[PDB]
Amino acid sequence: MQFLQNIPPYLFFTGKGGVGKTSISCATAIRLAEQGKRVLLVSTDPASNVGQVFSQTIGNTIQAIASVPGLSALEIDPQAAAQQYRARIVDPIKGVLPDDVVSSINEQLSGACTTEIAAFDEFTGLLTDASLLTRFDHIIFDTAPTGHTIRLLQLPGAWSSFIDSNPEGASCLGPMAGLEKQREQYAYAVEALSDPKRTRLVLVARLQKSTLQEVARTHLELAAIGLKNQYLVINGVLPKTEAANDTLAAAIWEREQEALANLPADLAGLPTDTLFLQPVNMVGVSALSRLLSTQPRPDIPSLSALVDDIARNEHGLIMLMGKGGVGKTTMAAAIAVRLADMGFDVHLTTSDPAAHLNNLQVSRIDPHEETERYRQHVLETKGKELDEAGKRLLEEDLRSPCTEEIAVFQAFSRVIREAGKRFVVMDTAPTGHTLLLLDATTPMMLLQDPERTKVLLVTLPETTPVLEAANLQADLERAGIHPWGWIINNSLSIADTRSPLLRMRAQQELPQIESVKRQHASRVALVPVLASEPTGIDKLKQLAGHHH
């Protein structure tokens, strides 16, 4: 693998939940240790499962890994880091300022943005500890900071700037107050990340048109900041051999192939490697090492069943939630089509420009134009009296992932009024953290009401995807919102295929589909992987399955 050659001391893997960052990190680490290298593998995930892959316990202390001489490990709990980042800011004012005021400050330090900044404070310490490079040849991270987090830290206004105590509170700048270290150490960490002789960044992706576009954008954001030592690793690729004697497998192999040849322009110049889809989720060293090779029914109702029950009261707000790319826009469209086809009045709203298109009206809003309106608004409102460096800090705050989630939700709110006379289906929504923040100043009670509103969480039958969905649900629950049901999309165990490998992946999904049914959701739906893309009504009608 090109990405495995002549690696510098720091190696970072980035990419969406579940693409294989940790798996690839572990396998890499083993490979390196076996070439006689001293390796430090830093586990950075919220519910670290790395100890498990090496059959041993790991902690916030560097411990050598028994089964792999040369390799040591370190767990940096992000939830815990955020919790402590939060405590350092709030404890001083507990019993000083009034409870509702402190409680409000605490909520500002409870979003993904704070977690991200806290993580960076942890990376920073590692990236600045010179002695570590005295003990290790390589330090590997299974996540990477985002362009937004890095830009925030490189802004002069982040140090010399007091933004009128976020009143309306559209702000996530609260976290900055918690920066433990000296401006200089973060600056250094950033140079270390931008230095190709020190840091190598691995973009992990899947051979799916959508993901590839997201990775492309990630690549541009990071290169623009100075991280130009980048490698792309396409994981989970279906080996052609398998396209033999199977409509599904041959069709998937076919779609990946197209995409492999029509990689988005911005990624074509990057060193690209591909890792083949393995039959069993890697649990040990043998399994992990196999990943770098160069050569190769659950009892859950159909989506129709969920629409069936949603239909029961003739109207309401149906909100689809979940991480990016899990299928919210697709599910939202399917649900809207079924309702419509059964004589109901449906108004489907979307933040994505793409839908074929009668008692089914579609409103598509443009995320970019809504974001800019919202940004304009928050600028004339909070930006006055701020010097230029302060305004740029605020503009970067308005580049947080939630900025867009708030502005689109804002717009969707025009039609959220129709959920009283008909069905309104939305394909996205803000986090519980954001809702609480917005409510501080927005139809909160409406969202909270079990009748008027049913929130659906979309996820995949995979470990990380389910955990991220559970976390998205926990957060919503804090905002007084209980997801009405979960939809497990892209399932193979509910699809028709004789591909031995595919049947093996489908069996791998069993435990995941099980934990959703008994530990996370009350009402659950299974949707098969359709092969090809569900671009039109026909296909969109196939995802649902049938009645009774």
Ligand SMILES: Nc1ncnc2c1ncn2[C@@H]1O[C@H](COP(=O)(O)OP(=O)(O)O)[C@@H](O)[C@H]1O
């Ligand atoms: N090429 C592959 N083929 C089959 N399984 C894989 C592959 N890559 C990862 N996985 C399996 O997928 C899950 C996805 O996870 P992980 O690698 O933890 O990714 P991330 O760190 O990006 O969430 C695990 O259950 C894992 O062992």
Ligand SMILES: Nc1ncnc2c1ncn2[C@@H]1O[C@H](COP(=O)(O)OP(=O)(O)O)[C@@H](O)[C@H]1O
């Ligand atoms: N069950 C499925 N079978 C095949 N492709 C699917 C399925 N669900 C989603 N996809 C495909 O996946 C992408 C995942 O996307 P999308 O539904 O846009 O979601 P989100 O709004 O969650 O980002 C699109 O390329 C899409 O058409």
Ligand SMILES: [Cl-]
């Ligand atoms: Cl946030």
Ligand SMILES: [Cl-]
């Ligand atoms: Cl936050």
Ligand SMILES: [Cl-]
């Ligand atoms: Cl942030």
Ligand SMILES: [Mg+2]
């Ligand atoms: Mg991981």
Ligand SMILES: [Mg+2]
């Ligand atoms: Mg979408």
Ligand SMILES: [Sb+3]
């Ligand atoms: Sb945010």
Ligand SMILES: [Sb+3]
């Ligand atoms: Sb926030």
Ligand SMILES: [Sb+3]
């Ligand atoms: Sb932010």
